[PDB]
UniProtKB/Swiss-Prot annotation:
Mg(2+) 1 binds at residues 923, 1008-1009. Changing residue 1044 to A: Loss of RNA polymerase activity. This is the catalytic subunit of the viral RNA-dependent RNA polymerase complex. This complex is involved in viral RNA replication that produces (+)-stranded genomes via a complementary, (-)-stranded intermediate. Binds RNA cooperatively with the host ribosomal protein S1. Residues 908-1040 form the RdRp catalytic domain. Changing residue 994 to A: Almost complete loss of infectivity. Mg(2+) 2 binds at residues 923, 1008-1009. This is RNA-directed RNA polymerase subunit beta. Its cofactor is Mg(2+). It is an enzyme of class 2 (transferase). Changing residue 720 to F: In strain: QB_1. One of its GO terms (biological process) is viral RNA genome replication. Changing residue 997 to A: 80% loss of infectivity.
Length: 1202
């Protein structure tokens, strides 16, 4: 058009307003400069008001103090990037200064004292930026802390110095206290939050004063914790601020803490769908070797990198074939695309690996041009090291002058070059995104053009197998007559047999040479990236290697101890630290395969790091590790991940006690001693503390049935009373034995006999008779068949067959580990021999079968006070295969909504059923011992039933020297018995459902633990009785207030699961267990029911003094009393991580079978092969044997206050 382009820039560069907002507002001033600028000025406020319908949840916080008068305001923008922009900073910095000098408490005074200049930005920037709440504080000495820009505190204290307020301001910034001291609590807010939590308690049935006292305790904590006084000082968590302050001469007159965006909602954003649903208007209108290049769009909020990411996808759809990331294809390569709406939030994903980048695409609108905050974009690109940036000029159809385009280009090509990107040489396409949606080929080509650059400018990423060999070492074995071998997964490159390789990492790098390469299955001549292999070496002993070093092509990789990195430490929500750390953080760093411990130094100016924020730190390790920049690592804390990070630049590199661990060790190994039955004594004092008659004799401990009425509280104790001593293996009182166990075993056998006979002969001589049982196995059979298959797939038999666990026909519990199963020859049954031959034909390693008998060992395990438990130890090659079908049955039962790895969903339905009364829970007595053969073949495909006959142990060898041939099909201890009873039970139960018009979906099962709708129970009972099973009338509940399933026991919805004292208590470990189980059964969140607390306290006095006070949080084990760890005198807080000591079972090392452990290692690589976001950088660890002595040890472990 008429208006010249050369002079709209002179106005553009004196305003900052858009390009078309200049070109058009200049045709109105007839082409007069100061005219058009004054036109825009007032024609501006409308823009602003046009903005304030956008949610502005970002922005910065500022703080200034004068002698002892301070103030704090937060001014909001809507983007992370603006918050740190040249201009925006200068604004909030003036609206802060001006607010100091002229003290301004009222927020409107200044909001309007600036409102004119506030538009002098919204116009330039184009984001809703509104100066939000301000307030101020003054006292005798008042200090301020500034956590970057996202959180500021103002602290005033009449009685302290500088260092102190700093610190207490630091604590306030990282603890969010609502009140300055516990008493400040709104007398009303608390008179009702207590008169409301006094119901929570009282409806559960608890007596008045117990609910009162409990609620009060809960209330004292509830308050104390949210009040500065009752908050553990964050730089000395072993003492509260209450005390920190009073021990210091001081007291705080008050505090103020603002965090950016508090209270504001900001409805979540989702890039994936948002584009897919924006092009939903325009949608209505062998080559796997292709590299995966990911890119990211970065630009102004409404310059429409949103609308562009659409066009790209649709246009590349009409022209070609196929963590919130949209993807699209080019004839040559496949692209992943992500939005970059937030500096910090990107830096986080690029570190956490949840999204890296090969090239960015900078999206600006030619309508406006580079926004002032565009340099922050480019700068984000610079900092993250994004190799290439392509620029898409958007909305060009709205610029009738072509010299204005070449002007914008100029502007952006220069910014690009202030930040070291190739400005003169960087590709820039001019095209509209919206028109390319409207099927307008003229502007459609401009999109294909852009992807045309993604194709040629963003370079193809080096394929993993083209980089120099490297295999992270997971384990070393010394193989007799073959030499040393390391196992790992080859991270990159290739290692051909005969090549020379270095082992560099934790010691003086050593060199060696590849003598071979093998997987469990075949043996190979080369190791190819991505493969889980074993690499054979020569002339290197097996103690000259450690898990943690790499094997690599010589000179490829070097050992380093010092490096400056960028890390993101996890937030609380993501399961990380819930507490900040400081100058001397001393965690462990996980490098592909091992923790190596190290010290960090913060950068220039930071002094605190909070769960959730980013950080550049220089880590310096204790001993070296093979690395170069780009290498990811986890930050670890006693096995828990609390951070992640990457190496940025490799630098040239340069507590506990004696008579404390020993003092506790001595106590641990003491023997707590008392008169009589300590367990029984405790139980009786617990009954007494709850107004219940104690046990008269040991005889009654186990002969006491509960009442299923009374309130939930009157029942919880009644139930505990009936269970707590019921499994105690140490009552003398009784002609009771394990002979009782066998009599049961012989009885199940005899019964299986009957049903094997019954189940083969139903021809009622007439046609009349039709029976429920008959009809159910007929239906069950058909459903199983459809679920299971004609026969077990080999594809499934292969990924589920394995060694694992306990004793076998040939290994005693002590040689239980899988390594001693590949080590020693396992037995095997005639029918089963073909399976192991089939296995032997598939591996080069030698599969050895020891004796070849049809026998298993029927043995005996303690279980009750009144009975033992019969079990079966299998030929260990049988087991290997019984765990195979057992594993496929496990996958298949998932289609019936049965998930056998999760007894959680069975506990909840027990809980539901006790309020709802619609689900019943049924328990079966002998179960694993009652599945007869007859029942098995009637129900199973013949193909299945055979491979079940093969893998089963048909005969049994008793301890009595004698023999049995099994009438049942299998016993607990058989690798598939659990799933086969699960499936047998589910199908039966489901068929009864169908027979009754109920949902098969309502039957859910875990072993012999059945939940189904309560109306199906009396039919189930009759069906079970038919197929053999004997139903426990005493333990199936289809009607009362009570249910039980998988260890959780419920009454009307309240958890009433008891605890058990199973063993005579003789050691401090033993006592602590009981005391802890009492703790858990009686605490409602760290708060004691006072009826038990008395008994706890009494018996706690029985332990060695130091041990009464050595406490751990919950979920950390039973090697210490569960309680407060900030109270724990022994807890040594090392390098900002708190270590507490616990009783360990003392164990001696043993020699592992190098071969069998190495097979086990490789057989596992094989298995995994046929199967936050930081678990991808951890492994599964080496084989170490040990035998536990009866002595105890003390181990220090990492803790956190919750
Ligand atoms: Ca049960």
């Amino acid at each position: 058009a008429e208006i010249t382009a050369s002079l709209v820039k002179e106005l553009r560069e004196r305003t900052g307003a858009g390009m078309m907002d200049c070109k058009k507002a200049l045709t109105e001033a007839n082409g007069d400069i100061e005219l058009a600028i004054e036109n825009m000025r007032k024609s501006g406020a409308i823009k602003a008001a046009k903005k304030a319908g956008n949610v502005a949840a970002d922005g910065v916080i500022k703080t200034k103090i004068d002698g002892n008068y301070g103030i704090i305001l937060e001014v909001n923008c809507q983007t992370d990037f603006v918050a740190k922009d040249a201009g925006f900073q200068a604004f909030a910095d003036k609206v802060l200064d001006a607010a100091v000098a002229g003290k301004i408490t009222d927020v409107e005074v200044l909001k309007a004292q600036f409102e004119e200049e506030r538009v002098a930005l919204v116009a330039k920037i184009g984001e809703n930026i509104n100066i939000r709440r301000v307030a101020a504080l003054e006292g005798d000495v008042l200090g301020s802390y500034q956590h970057g820009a996202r959180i500021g505190v103002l602290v005033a204290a009449k009685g302290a110095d500088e260092e102190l307020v700093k610190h207490i301001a630091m604590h306030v910034a990282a603890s969010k206290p609502e009140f300055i001291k516990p008493e400040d609590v709104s007398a009303e807010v608390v008179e009702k939050e207590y008169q409301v939590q006094l119901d929570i308690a009282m409806q559960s049935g608890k007596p008045k004063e117990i609910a009162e006292k409990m609620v009060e305790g809960r209330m004292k904590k509830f308050t104390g914790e949210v009040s500065l006084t009752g908050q553990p000082f964050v730089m000395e968590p072993s003492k509260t601020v209450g005390q920190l302050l009073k021990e210091h001469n001081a007291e705080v007159t008050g505090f103020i803490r603002f965090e950016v965006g508090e209270g504001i909602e900001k409805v979540e954003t989702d890039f994936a769908a948002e584009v897919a649903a924006m092009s939903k208007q325009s949608h209505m209108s062998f080559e796997r070797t292709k590299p995966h290049v990911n890119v990211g769009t970065i630009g102004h909020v409404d310059h429409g990198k949103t609308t562009l990411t659409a066009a790209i996808t649709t246009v590349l759809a009409k022209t070609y074939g196929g963590t919130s990331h949209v993807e699209y294809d080019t004839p040559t390569r496949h692209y992943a695309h992500v939005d970059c709406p937030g500096h910090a939030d990107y830096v986080k994903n690029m570190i956490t690996g949840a999204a890296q980048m090969d090239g960015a695409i900078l999206v600006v609108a030619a309508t406006d041009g580079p926004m002032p905050q565009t340099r922050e974009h480019i700068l984000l690109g610079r900092q993250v090291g994004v190799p290439y940036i392509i620029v898409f000029l958007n909305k060009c159809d709205m610029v009738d002058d072509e010299e204005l385009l070449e002007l914008v280009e100029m502007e952006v090509r220069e910014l690009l070059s202030q930040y070291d990107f190739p400005g003169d040489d960087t590709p820039i396409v001019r095209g509209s995104a919206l028109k390319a949606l409207e099927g307008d080929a003229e502007w459609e080509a401009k999109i294909l053009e852009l992807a045309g650059f993604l194709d040629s400018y963003i370079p193809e990423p080096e394929r993993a197998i083209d980089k120099p060999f490297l295999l992270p070492i997971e384990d070393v074995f010394s193989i007799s007559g073959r030499g040393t071998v390391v196992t790992g997964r080859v991270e990159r490159g290739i290692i051909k047999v005969g090549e020379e390789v270095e082992i560099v990492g934790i010691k003086e790098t050593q060199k060696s040479t590849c003598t071979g390469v093998e997987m469990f299955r075949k043996l190979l001549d080369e190791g190819r990236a991505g493969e889980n292999v074993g690499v054979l070496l020569r002339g290197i002993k097996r103690e000259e290697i450690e898990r943690g070093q790499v094997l690599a092509k010589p000179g490829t990789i070097k050992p380093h101890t010092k490096f400056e990195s960028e890390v993101y430490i996890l937030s609380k929500d993501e399961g990380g630290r819930h507490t900040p750390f400081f100058k001397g953080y001393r965690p462990q760093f996980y490098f592909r395969t091992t923790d190596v411990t190290g010290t960090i130094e913060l950068p220039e100016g930071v002094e605190m790091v909070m769960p959730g924020d980013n950080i550049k730190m220089v880590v310096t390790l204790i001993h070296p590790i093979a690395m170069d920049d780009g290498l990811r690592f986890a930050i670890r804390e006693g096995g828990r991940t609390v951070g992640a990070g990457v190496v940025a630049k490799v630098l040239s590199g340069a507590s506990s006690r004696n008579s404390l661990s020993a003092q506790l060790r001595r106590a641990a190994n003491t023997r707590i001693e008392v008169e009589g039955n300590l367990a029984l004594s405790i139980a009786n004092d617990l009954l007494l503390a709850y107004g219940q008659s104690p046990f008269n004799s040991e005889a009654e401990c186990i002969s006491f049935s509960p009442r299923f009425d009374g309130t939930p509280d009157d029942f919880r104790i009644n139930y505990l009373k009936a269970e707590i001593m019921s499994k105690y293996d140490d009552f003398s009182l009784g002609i009771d034995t394990e002979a009782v166990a066998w009599e049961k075993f012989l009885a199940a056998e005899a019964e299986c006999a009957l049903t094997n006979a019954r189940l083969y002969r139903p021809d009622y001589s007439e046609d009349f008779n039709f029976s429920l049982g008959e009809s159910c196995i007929h239906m069950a059979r058909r459903k199983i068949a459809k679920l299971i298959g004609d026969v077990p797939s080999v594809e499934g038999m292969l990924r589920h067959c394995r060694f694992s666990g306990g004793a076998t026909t040939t290994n005693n519990r002590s040689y239980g580990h899988p390594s001693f199963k590949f080590a020693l020859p396992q037995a095997c049954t005639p029918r089963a021999l073909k399976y192991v031959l089939a296995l032997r034909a598939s591996t080069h390693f030698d599969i050895r079968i020891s004796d070849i008998s049809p026998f298993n060992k029927a043995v005996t395990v303690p279980k009750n006070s009144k009975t033992d438990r019969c079990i079966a130890i299998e030929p260990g090659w049988n087991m290997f295969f019984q765990l195979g079908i057992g594993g496929i049955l496990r996958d298949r039962l998932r289609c019936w909504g049965i998930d056998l790895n999760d007894q959680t969903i069975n506990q909840r339905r027990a809980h539901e059923g006790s309020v709802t009364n619609n689900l019943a829970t049924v328990d079966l007595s002998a179960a694993s011992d009652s599945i007869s053969l007859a029942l098995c073949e009637l129900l199973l495909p013949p193909g299945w039933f055979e491979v079940l006959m093969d893998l089963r142990s048909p005969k049994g060898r008793l301890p009595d020297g004698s023999v049995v041939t099994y009438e049942k099909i299998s016993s607990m201890g058989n690798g598939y018995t659990f799933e086969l009873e699960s499936l047998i039970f589910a199908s039966l139960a489901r068929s009864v459902c169908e027979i009754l018009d109920l949902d098969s979906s309502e039957v859910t099962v875990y072993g012999d633990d059945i939940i189904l709708p309560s109306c199906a129970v009396p039919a189930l009972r009759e069906v079970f009785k038919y197929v053999g099973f004997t139903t426990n009338t005493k333990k199936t509940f289809s009607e009362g207030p009570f249910r039980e399933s998988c260890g959780k026991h419920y009454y009307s919805g309240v958890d009433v699961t008891p605890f058990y004292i199973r063993h005579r208590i003789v050691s401090p470990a033993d006592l602590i267990l009981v005391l802890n189980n009492l703790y858990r059964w009686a605490t409602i969140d760290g708060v004691w029911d006072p009826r038990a607390h008395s008994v706890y306290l009494k018996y706690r006095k029985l332990l060695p003094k130091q041990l009464q006070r050595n406490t751990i949080p919950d979920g950390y084990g039973d090697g210490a009393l569960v309680g407060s760890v900030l109270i724990n005198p022994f807890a040594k807080n090392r390098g900002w991580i708190r270590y507490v000591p616990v009783i360990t079972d003392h164990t001696r090392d043993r020699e592992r079978a190098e071969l069998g452990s190495y097979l086990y290692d490789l057989f596992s690589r094989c298995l995994s092969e046929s199967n936050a976001i930081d678990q991808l950088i951890c492994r599964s660890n080496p084989t170490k044997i040990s035998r536990s002595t009866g002595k105890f040890d003390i181990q220090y472990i990492a803790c956190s206050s919750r």
